[PDB]
Ligand SMILES: CCN(CC)C(=O)c1ccc(N)cc1
């Protein structure tokens with residue numbers, strides 16, 4: 001689990017969104033595994049605006065931060081999940097590293113701020129849902 005808090009926005013994995021997330025929906029994309037809900041409290045997190053391909057992610061299944069190299073956001077096919085059908089995910093970045101079902105929402109960050117959240121795992125790979133193209137997160 002995990003979320004991004006920027007301004008009056010909460011970013012979570014779409015498959016982990018709560019009833020309150022959906023009751024306060026700003027935006028969701030099934031193809032990206034993202035949902036954004038509105039918050040009353042102001043968020044502190046800064047979204048990276050950059051093309052970094054290196055950063056650090058939090059891995060809850062190891063209680064560790066790992067530095068990773070990752071691919072640019074792409075349409076990637078993702079193998080079977082106990083949350084989704086095996087299918088295409090857009091705006092996904094892959095790295096070599098550890099990711100298990102509870103690692104979703106772990107934040108990937110570079111020097112510019114938050115890059116994305118853990119969305120996929122298995123086969124020694126970790127997939128991150130990119131948020132850097134969501135420029136609208138930085139106003140209203
Ligand atoms: C997580 C999906 N879900 C119900 C399981 C909802 O978002 C939900 C929220 C408000 C509501 N009146 C009805 C449904």
Ligand SMILES: [Zn+2]
Nearest residue numbers: 050052110112
């Ligand atoms: Zn960066």
